[PDB]
Design a protein around this ligand. Structure first.
Ligand SMILES: *Cc1[nH]c(Cc2[nH]cc(CCC(=O)O)c2CC(=O)O)c(CCC(=O)O)c1CC(=O)O
Length: 294
């Protein structure tokens, strides 16, 4: 077949990523007919059902939303070129985090962003914030939050880069696994589709996210977990940093690992176990409601 059906969420951002993949596909294969099959973790389960019942051929996600476990037959096969993986500080009245006076309300529902925020500034009020980027920016403007933390990649792709007051360095707010990268899921036995996707995969980014995901997989993580996992390719080696923290910032467990690109997965697993054997297991047990990594 020459038709390629892309399943995707229906938010402005999700549709941006869908177009991104489509464009890349069209450029590598001028004869391919790409159809979008948008549809309303729960933010991935419906797309996976579409894949299993042949209503779509591939599903485009933001890497950090991709779960660590896949139903048999499905899997991640392509990881596209990574964008700015950093968190961004967005605010209208203030220019930085240090500038926020005591009692300021920062919005984010990410435990990863919160635990790190609270570790440095116990005086701030971290308040939950949910919805598409557009609604989040709306609530900020309505005055419900003094500031909010969002990813740099999302704002840039939406052309809302001017919203970024300051990009928070990884040392301050360690990025979520795969933040800034787009990943494509599809049926493992679908050779044709996989062959078409080969041109979109970005080796270096795949190296980094693999180390990040291996770490997360061992910890049995996801979005609702206070886990940071970020890798860089430094002078031919992968530098992996990871953290697990208590949502109140009182206890944050940190570790790092460095090694050859081909050991990306084992480095991830090793670092994860190191965190686990150092208390991460007790913290994660809270967040998981009894459940804790093996
Ligand atoms: C795992 C997780 N997902 C989200 C929501 C989300 N998913 C993708 C993006 C855009 C950035 C990207 O594609 O890399 C976003 C929104 C964003 O981060 O700007 C979150 C955010 C929850 C929140 O802040 O309320 C998370 C949790 C996490 O990042 O740790």
């Amino acid at each position: 077949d020459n038709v390629l059906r892309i399943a995707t969420r229906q938010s402005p951002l999700a549709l941006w990523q869908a177009h991104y993949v489509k464009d890349k596909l069209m450029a590598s294969h001028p004869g391919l007919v790409v159809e979008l099959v948008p549809m309303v973790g729960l933010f991935v389960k419906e797309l996976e059902v579409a894949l299993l019942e042949n209503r779509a051929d591939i599903a485009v996600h933001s890497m950090k939303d991709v779960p660590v476990e896949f139903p048999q037959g499905l899997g991640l096969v392509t990881i596209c070129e990574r964008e700015d993986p950093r968190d961004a500080f967005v605010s209208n009245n203030y220019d930085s985090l240090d500038a926020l006076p005591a009692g300021s309300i920062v919005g984010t529902s990410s435990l990863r962003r919160q635990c790190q925020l609270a570790e440095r500034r116990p005086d701030l009020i971290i308040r939950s914030l949910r919805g598409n980027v557009g609604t989040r920016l709306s609530k900020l403007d309505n005055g419900e939050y003094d500031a909010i933390i969002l990813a740099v990649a999302g704002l840039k792709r939406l052309g809302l880069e001017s919203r970024i007051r300051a990009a928070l360095p990884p040392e301050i707010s360690l990025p979520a696994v795969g933040q800034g990268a787009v990943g494509i899921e599809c049926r493992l036995d679908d050779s044709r589709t996989r062959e078409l996707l080969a041109a979109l995969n970005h080796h270096e980014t795949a190296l980094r996210v693999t180390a990040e995901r291996a770490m997360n997989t061992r910890l049995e993580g996801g979005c609702q977990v206070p886990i940071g996992s970020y890798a860089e390719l430094i002078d031919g080696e992968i530098w992996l940093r990871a953290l697990v923290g208590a949502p109140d910032g009182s206890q944050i467990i940190r570790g790092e690992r460095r090694g050859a690109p081909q050991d990306a997965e084992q480095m991830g697993i090793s670092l994860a176990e190191e965190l686990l054997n150092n208390g991460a297991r007790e913290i994660l047990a809270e967040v998981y409601n009894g459940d804790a990594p093996a």
